[PDB]
Symmetry: none
């Protein structure tokens, strides 16, 4: 089977367990990903990266395409969902999805209100993959295979400034991350 993604402990990523997604480049490279919100719009929440490298952000849970496989594997479609530690401020889901195109910035954002499950055309924008990033950790990729007939975007996920925050978006060069177990 496909090679497993590993956390910083070298342990295989397990679907359903909570992990921080932390920049593999610390210092000026910032910290972990978090359930963010635009200054002018509080819902749906967006995916942002904390600017301080010790702020790991909000943990995520992975949901495997292959339900019988407990391991999150490279180059394999999955759903990702934030697990907020605070009470919800929105009723939208915390599941990552690619947004509709943003004409005001030229970006295809990673935002929330995605859908867990039902791989196919209805849920195309909610399926992500992890690939190796050079020799420095791991990289998110949006290139779903869940709908063989669908035309889809295929691109790495990078970071991009917006609203005085660091958001995630489709980009030529993917930003590298490591995975740390979260209690």
């Amino acid at each position: 089977k496909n090679e497993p993604v590993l956390d910083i402990d070298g342990e295989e990523l397990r679907a359903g367990e909570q992990y921080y997604v932390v920049s593999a480049i610390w210092g000026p490279g910032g910290g972990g990903l978090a359930l963010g919100r635009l200054t002018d719009q509080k819902c749906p929440e967006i995916v942002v990266q904390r600017r301080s490298d010790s702020d790991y952000g909000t943990p995520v849970i992975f949901h495997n395409l292959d339900t019988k496989d407990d391991i999150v594997r490279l180059s394999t479609d999955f759903n990702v969902e934030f697990v907020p530690i605070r009470d919800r401020l929105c009723l939208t889901s915390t599941v990552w999805k690619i947004d509709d195109y943003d004409t005001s910035t030229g970006q295809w954002w990673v935002t929330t209100n995605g859908v867990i499950g039902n791989p196919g055309p209805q849920t195309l924008q909610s399926w992500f993959k992890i690939e190796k990033s050079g020799n420095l950790g791991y990289k998110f990729n949006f290139c779903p295979s869940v709908c063989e007939s669908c035309v889809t975007l295929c691109s790495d996920i990078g970071r991009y400034g917006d609203d005085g925050q660091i958001r995630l978006a489709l980009a030529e060069r993917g930003w590298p991350f490591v995975f740390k177990k979260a209690s």
Copy 2:
């Protein structure tokens, strides 16, 4: 957000943990639920009820629709997986699902080889709910909400004799169970 399901100790049912599912009616109401098999079918395994009220049967684990919620709640879709004490003879799953209609009996049986997670049309038959049956008991119900566009069966789960054994099937009124922590 809904009301939690409680075990016999008054404690909220924890997703992920092993619980016996024991009939709230003892004596001729029998005991707990268990993996079974038929004469005409070794695999997949079926859902049966042990007939002795001292037999708690096979422990189960509840998988919430929402993995972020550590609590099994009422009127909320979940998956149920038997955690066998003995080793698996069948390699099919121990996850409950509603079978295809059985023309020989008129029954929609609760069997196994269901699927954990992947909420939506592909797993519709694997989602179950718990409803109140009085004040000390809980009834199983099949009426999934995971696929808004799907037409679905919607019915309580009761018991029905088949093959000399007690099976579970869709029925107009549901059988009441209590939940007992298996570690205890």
